[PDB]
Amino acid sequence: LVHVASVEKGRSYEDFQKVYNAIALKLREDDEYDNYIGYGPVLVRLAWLISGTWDKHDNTGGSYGGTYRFKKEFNDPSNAGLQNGFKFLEPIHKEFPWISSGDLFSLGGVTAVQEMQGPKIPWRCGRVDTPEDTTPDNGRLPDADKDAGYVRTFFQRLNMNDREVVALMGAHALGKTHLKNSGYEGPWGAANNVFTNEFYLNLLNEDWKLEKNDANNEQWDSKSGYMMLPTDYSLIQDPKYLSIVKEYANDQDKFFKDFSKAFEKLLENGITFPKDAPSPFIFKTLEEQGL
Numbered sequence: 001l002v003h004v005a006s007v008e009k010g011r012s013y014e015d016f017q018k019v020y021n022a023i024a025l026k027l028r029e030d031d032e033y034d035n036y037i038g039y040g041p042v043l044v045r046l047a048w049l050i051s052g053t054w055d056k057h058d059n060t061g062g063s064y065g066g067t068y069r070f071k072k073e074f075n076d077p078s079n080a081g082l083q084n085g086f087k088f089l090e091p092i093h094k095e096f097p098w099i100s101s102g103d104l105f106s107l108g109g110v111t112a113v114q115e116m117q118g119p120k121i122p123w124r125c126g127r128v129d130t131p132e133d134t135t136p137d138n139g140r141l142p143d144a145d146k147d148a149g150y151v152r153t154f155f156q157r158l159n160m161n162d163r164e165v166v167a168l169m170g171a172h173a174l175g176k177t178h179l180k181n182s183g184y185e186g187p188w189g190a191a192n193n194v195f196t197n198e199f200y201l202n203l204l205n206e207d208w209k210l211e212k213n214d215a216n217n218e219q220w221d222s223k224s225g226y227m228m229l230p231t232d233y234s235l236i237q238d239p240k241y242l243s244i245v246k247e248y249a250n251d252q253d254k255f256f257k258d259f260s261k262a263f264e265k266l267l268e269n270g271i272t273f274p275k276d277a278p279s280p281f282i283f284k285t286l287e288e289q290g291l
């Protein structure tokens with residue numbers, strides 16, 4: 001399959017900036033969500049999950065098609081709890097009905113990160129809604145109860161190497177797990193709605209205890225009240241991963257640059273951008289525009 005990016009007819013940068021500003025104003029207003037964490041986290045998770053079904057082998061899945069809109073994908077057990085990000089974007093879509101779904105789902109992740117003080121993520125428009133039959137089957141998203149090998153292997157399918165995997169995982173600094181959703185419970189740190197290298201620090205500085213939770217699954221618990229999934233923990237069990245965790249724990253900048261590149265790639269996987277395609281856009285935050 002070849003998925004060529006096709007710009008929404010007659011729209012430009014300014015048009016996308018407006019979609020971004022709307023998502024952003026809504027993030028600021030609906031701040032009570034999940035006990036005051038806000039929807040930032042959940043949006044970031046939404047953008048990763050619609051992008052993560054990609055398969056470098058036959059080019060199926062990935063962000064392009066906005067397949068998450070279909071029942072099959074929408075009811076994926078691994079996407080439990082994403083319905084909240086969806087419901088949050090709906091009114092935005094209603095306001096800007098010419099944007100494709102894939103472009104919207106992905107733009108929300110960028111918006112969330114940038115408004116939560118993370119780095120600027122260049123983003124590209126062009127995703128095109130595809131038919132319900134292009135919807136990927138469930139089971140392509142990762143399990144959390146595994147080790148570093150499973151992780152390396154899994155990631156490979158999305159074309160990401162070690163450095164990319166570690167950078168992307170630092171997104172775990174945001175939000176938290178929910179028993180009802182994933183069988184895991186608790187946040188990964190304290191500033192759960194601000195984008196920082198906290199994840200790396202917690203992983204290296206806390207005194208973690210393995211324990212089983214109320215869903216009868218194992219998780220690493222810290223006395224600070226934080227948690228880490230086996231997959232996150234695996235980052236300090238693997239020597240190659242561990243040196244990267246260290247690097248990030250030590251340099252937020254680095255982490256920010258690496259995350260930015262990785263995140264964009266992840267969201268662009270499976271998409272072909274013609275040479276005439278516009279450059280990636282860099283949106284201003286609400287703050288940069290004085291709004």
Ligand code: HEM
Nearest residue numbers: 041042044045048142143144168171175176177178181182
């Ligand atoms: C092996 C890789 C991954 C696994 C196994 C994993 C698994 C999980 C699980 C089990 C949840 C908690 C869901 C809940 O109960 O609500 C979670 C939440 C989250 N995921 Fe990951 N995840 C992975 C990779 C990623 C990546 C690459 C990103 C983005 C770069 C992502 C961003 C997050 C965010 C931001 C949250 C919090 C959502 C919220 O607070 O509602 N994670 N992840």
